[PDB]
């Protein structure tokens, strides 16, 4: 695959599986599974309080506070309405599925529960894409600490909204081949004119962002997405937001990808050279 | 004078002869099976543990089948570990003199042995077998028994230590099953290094020292820093857990504790034995090792008389069969001598030690 | 707790190599003035000639030593790319070996295109001397 | 080329001249059988280490002995991805340092590569082959970090124009 | 000993 | 293991290394009658299904034999009772096979020579080859009331998957 | 005329007085004899007594003994008194490998360079029926490669790692006569230093010593490319000879004037003495056919050149071996027709 | 930290991959890749389920017999474990994988370069599959009963393993292998369909022979009365499978019933379908127990531990109890037959023990050492790893015991 999914292929798996054994009329069995995502996310799919026709999906994020600032609650309830109920102990938005009271088309509620990080994340881009497009400016930049060290710095203009990445890079050789990608991410202009504008700084911040206390190091790289209003509005709202909230964990998959194809190269050149080295032998002639 | 019989009572090995002999006449193992046999070994470090075994043991030496002589019209000499107690010294005589009677009995002590073979009367004997190494100063042909030294660190610890050695590798190897392959393992691929830094330097740089070994079940194992790791437990005993100063050191030792006119003779003629002293790079690193101990504790620093100082370790290439060797010209030498051999006058008589030897 | 390993014996020892030289110096280097004098005639092979001439194989000091590889670097690199083949032929055979060694010597000093023409200073002197020109590179006691 | 095969026929004749070996066992040491170029315990028995350099960064280094030759290759390094492309190159090379019977597990200082050629190699193989070898190394080992580079630049303009289709 | 079997499936 | 005969007694005659043991035939022959109502043939058939599947067996006792030749014969008459219809027909069918000349112990061809030993002179080869031919056709005989069934003209698919598996790889027609 | 043998190395070859069994060491601690069954060889006898790698086998012909010196410091005599052969232990008194032996031209005594910076001579005492061993250790200062005995019995040349050449008197009185006046000296005591050379600024170690038919010549092939001939009776002038080639590993004086070498090249090549002091190439004695791998018959080094002949007296043939694993023995008078001016 | 780490158990014929605390695996995949056959080209490939049947991939296997043979495979398993199945970012996790028995530690040096080169793990624990089968084994019995000394029979898709271990350690010179396991029964099974029944088409022949096994087998005590149950009341015994055809979608329904017992009958009868094989795999444990040393036979004869899939037939460790007591104790009266001194030795019990995660025993072994506190102590971190090297993880602590 190139592009990243943005539904959880577990929380999919197991609520087919249990909504599949509801409808066929069997007796229901116990769930306790704890799981993880990208960003440091964590799941939780179990029974509350022993009750096995009830299935709760919890999801604990150490950034709720930044996104509940931004009317998270209001997308939660508009996007999953009655399976939203009060939040479990240590995680932050729960969802309950009741077997005996589901719907006929159980799709659709499953790939809504596969997207509960995407609609946690959502909230700030609507926001401040309902900026962009009321014209209402000088609004306050968000800033959400999606990581520990990584942040996120989202602005909306009179013409344009400013998504900004600072990302940090583990090792000099992830620094060197993401200079590289994000050179070709500068010049992605070949691709007609209708992208989102991509630009990169290496170890310093933008100008825009100077009077904030923002990273300054040498594994630290900058990535501003401008998306214009053929981006913005809301024919395309949502590919735009699955597209720009998974950009991160897109860029360092591509990263390790080309890493395993250097070991792959650097194999088949290593046992080419052994069999030049084994070729002169006079036992092997 | 007759025919002078020598055996040797090796804890591995038993070879009999006779006195002039340049080759041992008969060598088999000590192996005493009971009915698919239950063989047990009645010698553990030199000292008896099942007399009856090694009574048995002496029936089949004095039987027909190997040597098929008389037990009262001959003369035979004994051999006797280091540091051997009183008791069983006095038990094997007693066994001599009373359920075989030989006319002549001379049990020798090992070190004495060891000198006797290469033609030497003073000097220092390492003995490193299989369950403990001794150290043994002879003067004029006589051992010291009050600066024997002894060292708990042989070919056993060794085994273990590169079992350990080669479970850090990533080998499976159990302690109590796979002894006897790494124990092989020992035998033909470990080396006494000489330089430990350097060794080192050249196992982490280099692949030179790798060598592949074929086990019994068919894996082909690599053994690589391990062959110079694994013997150096005798220099550095905290490796293996063992309050100690090392072989070198304990040498040191017991060569500075003697009298003063007789360090030059000792320094010149140490004389490596046993089977655990067959590591290649052996005398060499414990000539360097003295010639470091000598420099820094009693030139105190200064290396103007350092070359002045001679040393000289000579390890014999026929290592095989030296105490059967030595006793063979122990007994060639006092074929007519019968004044140094007990006879069974004095073994009536009170015998108080052989009269004392 | 050991405090004794750490010292080399084998420094000294009494049957260790010395090298054993006979002393000397082999009249320094080669002289400065006259192959400059050579050298503004135009006269390259009477340069070359005069530049391999007295090397500092008998010499302690490292200082004459670099000032002959520099003088003779300084020819070398002051030649054409033609005459390299005439200049080689008309030396002798202890001057092919002199000249390998310098021209080893200078391998160790890079200087923008000063390899680039002692490669191929290197190929015609190994055409004119043989591989065992460079044997004796390996082999000598005293360098350059 | 331009200044590639002269350097290479330098350094194919230098180890040509280099690679004359014999068994020889240790003076100081009873029994062992060590490569002198790597204890050097004895200075009769190593030759001159000598220098091939083509520029100022690209440079060969030959030193011989009686009965070992390390010979460490410097490599050229145009920028950053060329240098960490190279870098793991000699690391993924050097990890499987048991395979290759003739190189080092790590280089000397200020160079890439290295190999230590002894006389058990010498005897199991032919020389002249290891001297190909070596200049057959010299070649590839650049040869391929070119086709790395090229298909690092190829794949980040596939991943990017894929990524900036879809909005 | 015997144990009887179970004639059913999985 | 395997599975081996229990009809062994001391008071039994012995041809060859085999054993003559009693048997219900209605056709004449050597073997003597037996007031019980087990028999070697009925063994055999009720260890046939086990005995089959295996390639190695060991000789226990002198009926063993005589369980290998039946076990045999048993894998003879389903590879010729595959192709037929009714009851009637494989009854005559095997009333043809019985009547037929196998090789006997001597005779090339014939598996595990190396086991059975050969006749002693002519009439014990008489005797040897009616008690084999009273053995097949009563073989046949308690095999075609078996292979059938009540729902008649079809021989059953439970013993008809056993055509190509032979004892200890060796067959008797080859 | 090349036979392979293995496709191991061939450490050292030695032949007996008929040229019919030929001891070689395939590159371990066993010596085997191989004998002509015919118009092939066969494995005849098989030697196991080291424990360690072989390093040196030399065949007395009139006594009809193998010496044999190996890594394990140690020196087998090995003579066949029935059909299976028997060896002796000598003791060498040496802490070091054993490099090279040699046997003396009467039979009597034996000499075995090791890195013990050592050479012993050793000979046989039948007071206790074994070898005693003397050495000669004053001038040498490295490890002992290669040795070489005088014609009359006496003295030895030995080339070494410390870029000398010496020729030692190794008169042993105990079996030796008194030697007549030589050249080289008139005072002969047992490890006395004849001659020494080998000063020549770029020292090599010197691989392979030969001693004249007469005597009074030796050549010496160092590892700087350099092939040199003293001559004692001329002053004792040493006449060296640079060559363009690769180091050589040993050198055989065929004639007065004549000397054979061979070496890393994997090529014979023939060197020429004259009577004035000058020594000139004169070829290549492995030319290849031309009809329009190496284009050698050796594809790796020749370490050895003995005589297949009659010696030094009159020779014609000489055999080579070497790492390739090959024995190639080469005749005078096939190469003198086909090399044109060649007329030795 | 507070993120579980992630467990990945590659088979040969399925990989179990979850995360660490869980009880079942979160995902359990065919262990096959199908690839296309410069530029993003090596992306376009596909795991798991997704990689049996597509018309214009070719589907390869990298692992046989436990061993990887291709490495770029592998490497590319591992892209589409981590970050499309898991959806770890894999710097934030720490890594349990698994080994097969008598690895070299050249495979744990590429597994690790695989791991710490290409993917920044930050730990990553190399384990042995039979200490982690008998630590899972633990939830069955008492607390003073969890040790780490027993024999573990390992059956899943390719060589049968009888390994013992003794205190957390594997015995590698005893370690016995039957070629015997689960395609092996699918194989005959497909031949005695093949052999009697009809209609089974020969595109899905191996499916259908499959869940025959899942479903309907077992072992048996006695075959003969087994067979005269399946002949006399032959309506109960019998039973039927149906199915549904890939092409031209048609219900077909075959009779199952001489296979259900016949097919489990090859472990204890290996010579009815292996011909170079013959001794059943009581004699293989009673060998590798009496190829042990003598004061550790007791508790490897005490414990045995039954893993993997095709040890999940029903009563299957109660015959190989039966069989195991058997054949012990015929040796016991045989001493005491031969000799007759009155020694009479102890009498010895055997123990098979079954329990419930039994056919995800690795994983479960795997998910219970990796969430404990010291698992975070027995690592190989990627500064040690930068630091001394790839020969860290030559060598794995074992675990001491707990819970
Ligand atoms: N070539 C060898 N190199 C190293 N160790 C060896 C070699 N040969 C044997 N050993 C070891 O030496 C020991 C045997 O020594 P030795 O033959 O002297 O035994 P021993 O006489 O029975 O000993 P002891 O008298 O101390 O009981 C064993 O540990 C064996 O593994
Ligand atoms: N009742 C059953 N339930 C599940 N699987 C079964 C059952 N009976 C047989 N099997 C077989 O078990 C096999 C699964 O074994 P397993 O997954 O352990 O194999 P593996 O990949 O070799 O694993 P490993 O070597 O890690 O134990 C499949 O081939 C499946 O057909
Ligand atoms: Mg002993
Ligand atoms: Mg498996």
Redesign the pocket.
Known sequence: MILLEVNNRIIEETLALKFENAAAGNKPEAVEVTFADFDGVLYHISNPNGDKTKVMVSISLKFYKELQAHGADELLKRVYGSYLVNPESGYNVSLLYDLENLPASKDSIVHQAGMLKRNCFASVFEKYFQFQEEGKEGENRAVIHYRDDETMYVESKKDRVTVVFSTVFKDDDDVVIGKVFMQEFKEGRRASHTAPQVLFSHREPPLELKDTDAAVGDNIGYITFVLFPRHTNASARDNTINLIHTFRDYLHYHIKCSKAYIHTRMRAKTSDFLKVLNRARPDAE | GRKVVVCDNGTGFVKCGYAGSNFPEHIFPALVGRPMLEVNYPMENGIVRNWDDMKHLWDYTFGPEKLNIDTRNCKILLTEPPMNPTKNREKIVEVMFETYQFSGVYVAIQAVLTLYAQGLLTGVVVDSGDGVTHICPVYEGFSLPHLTRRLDIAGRDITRYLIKLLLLRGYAFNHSADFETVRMIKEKLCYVGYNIEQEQKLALETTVLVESYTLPDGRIIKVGGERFEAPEALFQPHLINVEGVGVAELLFNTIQAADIDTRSEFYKHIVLSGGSTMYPGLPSRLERELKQLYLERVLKGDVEKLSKFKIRIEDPPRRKHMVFLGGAVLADIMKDKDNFWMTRQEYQEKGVRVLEK | SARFRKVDVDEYDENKFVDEEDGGDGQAGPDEGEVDSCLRQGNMTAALQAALKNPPINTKSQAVKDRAGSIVLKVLISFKANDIEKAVQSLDKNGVDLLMKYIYKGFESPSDNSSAVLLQWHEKALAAGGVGSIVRVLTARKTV | TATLRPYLSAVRATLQAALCLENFSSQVVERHNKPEVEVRSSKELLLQPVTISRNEKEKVLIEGSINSVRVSIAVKQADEIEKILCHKFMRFMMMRAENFFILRRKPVEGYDISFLITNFHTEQMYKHKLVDFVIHFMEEIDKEISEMKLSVNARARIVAEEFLKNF | DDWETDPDF? | PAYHSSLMDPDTKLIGNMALLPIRSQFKGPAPRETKDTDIVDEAIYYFKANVFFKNYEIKNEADRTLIYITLYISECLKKLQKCNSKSQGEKEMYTLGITNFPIPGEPGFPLNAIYAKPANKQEDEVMRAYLQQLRQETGLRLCEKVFDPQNDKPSKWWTCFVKRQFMNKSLSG | SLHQFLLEPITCHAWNRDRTQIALSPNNHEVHIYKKNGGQWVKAHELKEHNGHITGIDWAPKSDRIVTCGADRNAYVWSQKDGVWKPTLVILRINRAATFVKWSPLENKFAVGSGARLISVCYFESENDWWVSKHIKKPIRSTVLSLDWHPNNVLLAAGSCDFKCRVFSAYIKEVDEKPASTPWGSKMPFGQLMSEFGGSGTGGWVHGVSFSASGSRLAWVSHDSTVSVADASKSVQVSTLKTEFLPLLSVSFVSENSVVAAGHDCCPMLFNYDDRGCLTFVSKLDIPKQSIALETLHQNSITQVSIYEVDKQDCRKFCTTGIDGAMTIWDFKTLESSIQGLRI | GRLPACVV?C????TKLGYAGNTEPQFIIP?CIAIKEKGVDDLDFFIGDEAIEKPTYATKWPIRH?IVEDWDLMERFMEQVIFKYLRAEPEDHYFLL?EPPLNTPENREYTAEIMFESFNVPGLYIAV?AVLALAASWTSRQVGERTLTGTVI?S???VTHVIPVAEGYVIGSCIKHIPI???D??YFIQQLLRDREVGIPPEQSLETA?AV??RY?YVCPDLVKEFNKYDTDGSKWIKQYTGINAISKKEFSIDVGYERFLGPEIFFHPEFANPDFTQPISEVVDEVIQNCPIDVRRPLYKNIVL????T??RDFGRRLQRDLKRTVDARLKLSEELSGGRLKPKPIDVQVITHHMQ?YA?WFGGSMLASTPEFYQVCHTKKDYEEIGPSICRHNPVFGVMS
């Open positions: 999985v | 158990d088979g040969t014929g399925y262990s436990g698994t599959q390992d899943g898709d390719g396991a689960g395609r029964i699918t499959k096994k899942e087998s893993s993997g899939g095709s999940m037939f056919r690795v």
